Amino acid sequence: MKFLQLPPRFMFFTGKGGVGKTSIACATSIQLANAGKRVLLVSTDPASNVGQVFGVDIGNRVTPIPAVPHLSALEIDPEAAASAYRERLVGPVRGVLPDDVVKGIEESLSGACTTEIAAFDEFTALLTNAVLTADYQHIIFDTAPTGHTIRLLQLPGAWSGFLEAGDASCLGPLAGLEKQRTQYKAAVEALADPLQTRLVLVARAQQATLREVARTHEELATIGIKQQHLVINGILPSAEAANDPLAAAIHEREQTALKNIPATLTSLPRDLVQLKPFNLVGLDALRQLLTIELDEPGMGDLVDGIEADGHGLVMLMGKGGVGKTTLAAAIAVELAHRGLPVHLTTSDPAAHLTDTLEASLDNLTVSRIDPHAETERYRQHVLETKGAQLDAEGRALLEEDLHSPCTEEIAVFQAFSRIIREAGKKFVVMDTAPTGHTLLLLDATGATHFTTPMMQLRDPNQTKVLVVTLAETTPVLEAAKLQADLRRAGIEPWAWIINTSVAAASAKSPLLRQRAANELREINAVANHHADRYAVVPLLKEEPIGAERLRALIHPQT
Ligand SMILES: Nc1ncnc2c1ncn2[C@@H]1O[C@H](COP(=O)(O)OP(=O)(O)O)[C@@H](O)[C@H]1O
Ligand SMILES: Nc1ncnc2c1ncn2[C@@H]1O[C@H](COP(=O)(O)OP(=O)(O)O)[C@@H](O)[C@H]1O
Ligand SMILES: [Mg+2]
Ligand SMILES: [Mg+2]
């Protein structure tokens, strides 16, 4: 394993949720501890099962693991840190200010951005404290700050009065940070030094995930992080597809993705972690990491319900890579084939799916919004309109703020609002929906680009915010977090779509069978608690492109 050769003190990991960052971090900690060097696995999520895996009740304090000699396990809680930020920044203004101001402060201080900044705060706490670096030879983190957070916290300063002064800006949480700016600067400097940091990039062997990790690598390199490594975790063994139709397609897709890694990631020391058969639960399985008839409702019922409740919006929401674009296209194609008008509006210019049928059907009008261009246009608009009077430091800080994911979400939502307005009395199937944070923040900043009123979205009779999940543990947990954010924003997700379900694809191989069992457990969990109306989409051995094979999703042959 190239990412483990002469590792520096801090070994971060990052990538799309569910790739296997935590499992790889745990296995690396085990391997280094076996080598005789003290380690400190800093799990960066309370919901992680690291404590169960090691058989210890890991908490905010360092808990040595008796099972693994020389291994200590910490567990940061970013969401707890964000809640503490809210408690210590909103209580003082509670009552002292009108309820509108308090609500705006809470909303600007709540969401994914505040969680990321709090996680970076804890990372800086662990990155500059002399006690930790003088006691453990390897502080193996589990998740790394996004490039945006590092860029924001490495700026010259002046981020001390951005609270109570929303304006669709996620720059407020900076005021919560109670530490010296020198602390964060030193943390970033130690993070960018190749001799103290090794920011590994865990990614699955799929096109979308590889492109996403390539983008993250480009951003991190722009930060200053020079030496990185790539861990392509999830490669399916070749011998597994020997006598199976679905495993053969999976392996072919994995190999095709490997042969077309983005040019930016080619030079990185690459690693390949096979899909180990035994489930990675407990220390026994992790020690060797680095070395059925499903009957659940399909998308037919969901599309039938949408058809029954006509003249509405069907906004697909969820984390990137789940399959929102393909599902939206399939829904739109099915609705068009039912005779009702549709206005499919995707936001994935790379994919040409449903472009072979836009003209064949006189009612399936298609709009292709380019997220990058919309984000750039919004950035220019708000830089010229706002911040022109700001001093050099304010302009730099606002420009850095505008690169946050929420700015891209706001720009895409603004571009989709005009699509909604133009198309009236017809279905409007979308690809992405703004997270609850974005919607609430836009609503707070009431006073050419326009955003649809929150009243229309909140009404169940005019909107249906579907939530797409990849049918795994962490993807389902983060989709549930998205659902909670939407519910806080007032919108009730109409249904759930458990996309890419190997369980519904009739797996006929060992590894795919164990994967099907895991995804069946996750589907049961989704049905019981998270969603009262869900649909499981089978995995397709042929990549969905065009109507003739997009309709396979909606109406599978079961
Ligand atoms: N190399 C692998 N082989 C088999 N299963 C894996 C592998 N890597 C990860 N997994 C599975 O993926 C699941 C979730 O991965 P996890 O590391 O928790 O993602 P995250 O980095 O978001 O925490 C785990 O339950 C684990 O069983
Ligand atoms: N049901 C499915 N079966 C097989 N592959 C799928 C399915 N749904 C999505 N995919 C694959 O996932 C990839 C990325 O999905 P996409 O919808 O582009 O994600 P995003 O929501 O980020 O746009 C696509 O290339 C597609 O081939
Ligand atoms: Mg994790
Ligand atoms: Mg998409």
TrEMBL record:
<feature type="binding site">
    <location>
        <position position="23"/>
    </location>
    <ligand>
        <name>ATP 2</name>
    </ligand>
</feature>
<feature type="binding site">
    <location>
        <position position="323"/>
    </location>
    <ligand>
        <name>ADP 2</name>
    </ligand>
</feature>
<feature type="binding site">
    <location>
        <position position="538"/>
    </location>
    <ligand>
        <name>ATP 1</name>
    </ligand>
</feature>
<keyword id="KW-0067">ATP-binding</keyword>
<feature type="binding site">
    <location>
        <position position="474"/>
    </location>
    <ligand>
        <name>ADP 1</name>
    </ligand>
</feature>
<feature type="binding site">
    <location>
        <position position="20"/>
    </location>
    <ligand>
        <name>ADP 1</name>
    </ligand>
</feature>
<feature type="binding site">
    <location>
        <position position="18"/>
    </location>
    <ligand>
        <name>ATP 2</name>
    </ligand>
</feature>
<feature type="binding site">
    <location>
        <position position="274"/>
    </location>
    <ligand>
        <name>ADP 1</name>
    </ligand>
</feature>
<feature type="domain" description="AAA+ ATPase">
    <location>
        <begin position="310"/>
        <end position="492"/>
    </location>
</feature>
<feature type="binding site">
    <location>
        <position position="276"/>
    </location>
    <ligand>
        <name>ATP 2</name>
    </ligand>
</feature>
<protein>
    <recommendedName>
        <fullName>arsenite-transporting ATPase</fullName>
        <ecNumber>7.3.2.7</ecNumber>
    </recommendedName>
</protein>
<comment type="similarity">
    <text>Belongs to the arsA ATPase family.</text>
</comment>
<keyword id="KW-0479">Metal-binding</keyword>
<feature type="binding site">
    <location>
        <position position="326"/>
    </location>
    <ligand>
        <name>ADP 2</name>
    </ligand>
</feature>
<feature type="binding site">
    <location>
        <position position="499"/>
    </location>
    <ligand>
        <name>ATP 1</name>
    </ligand>
</feature>
<feature type="binding site">
    <location>
        <position position="499"/>
    </location>
    <ligand>
        <name>ADP 2</name>
    </ligand>
</feature>
<feature type="binding site">
    <location>
        <position position="280"/>
    </location>
    <ligand>
        <name>ATP 2</name>
    </ligand>
</feature>
<feature type="binding site">
    <location>
        <position position="324"/>
    </location>
    <ligand>
        <name>ATP 1</name>
    </ligand>
</feature>
<feature type="binding site">
    <location>
        <position position="323"/>
    </location>
    <ligand>
        <name>ATP 1</name>
    </ligand>
</feature>
<feature type="domain" description="AAA+ ATPase">
    <location>
        <begin position="7"/>
        <end position="224"/>
    </location>
</feature>
<dbReference type="InterPro" id="IPR027417">
    <property type="entry name" value="P-loop_NTPase"/>
</dbReference>
<feature type="binding site">
    <location>
        <position position="22"/>
    </location>
    <ligand>
        <name>Mg(2+) 1</name>
    </ligand>
</feature>
<feature type="binding site">
    <location>
        <position position="472"/>
    </location>
    <ligand>
        <name>ATP 2</name>
    </ligand>
</feature>
<feature type="binding site">
    <location>
        <position position="326"/>
    </location>
    <ligand>
        <name>ATP 1</name>
    </ligand>
</feature>
<feature type="binding site">
    <location>
        <position position="540"/>
    </location>
    <ligand>
        <name>ADP 2</name>
    </ligand>
</feature>
<feature type="binding site">
    <location>
        <position position="431"/>
    </location>
    <ligand>
        <name>Mg(2+) 3</name>
    </ligand>
</feature>
<dbReference type="GO" id="GO:0005524">
    <property type="term" value="F:ATP binding"/>
</dbReference>
<keyword id="KW-0547">Nucleotide-binding</keyword>
<dbReference type="InterPro" id="IPR027541">
    <property type="entry name" value="Ars_ATPase"/>
</dbReference>
<feature type="binding site">
    <location>
        <position position="22"/>
    </location>
    <ligand>
        <name>Mg(2+) 2</name>
    </ligand>
</feature>
<feature type="binding site">
    <location>
        <position position="540"/>
    </location>
    <ligand>
        <name>ATP 1</name>
    </ligand>
</feature>
<feature type="binding site">
    <location>
        <position position="276"/>
    </location>
    <ligand>
        <name>ADP 1</name>
    </ligand>
</feature>
<feature type="binding site">
    <location>
        <position position="543"/>
    </location>
    <ligand>
        <name>ADP 2</name>
    </ligand>
</feature>
<feature type="binding site">
    <location>
        <position position="233"/>
    </location>
    <ligand>
        <name>ATP 2</name>
    </ligand>
</feature>
<feature type="binding site">
    <location>
        <position position="19"/>
    </location>
    <ligand>
        <name>ADP 1</name>
    </ligand>
</feature>
<feature type="binding site">
    <location>
        <position position="23"/>
    </location>
    <ligand>
        <name>ADP 1</name>
    </ligand>
</feature>
<feature type="binding site">
    <location>
        <position position="325"/>
    </location>
    <ligand>
        <name>ATP 1</name>
    </ligand>
</feature>
<dbReference type="InterPro" id="IPR025723">
    <property type="entry name" value="ArsA/GET3_ATPase-like"/>
</dbReference>
<feature type="binding site">
    <location>
        <position position="22"/>
    </location>
    <ligand>
        <name>ADP 1</name>
    </ligand>
</feature>
<feature type="binding site">
    <location>
        <position position="274"/>
    </location>
    <ligand>
        <name>ATP 2</name>
    </ligand>
</feature>
<dbReference type="GO" id="GO:0016887">
    <property type="term" value="F:ATP hydrolysis activity"/>
</dbReference>
<feature type="binding site">
    <location>
        <position position="538"/>
    </location>
    <ligand>
        <name>ADP 2</name>
    </ligand>
</feature>
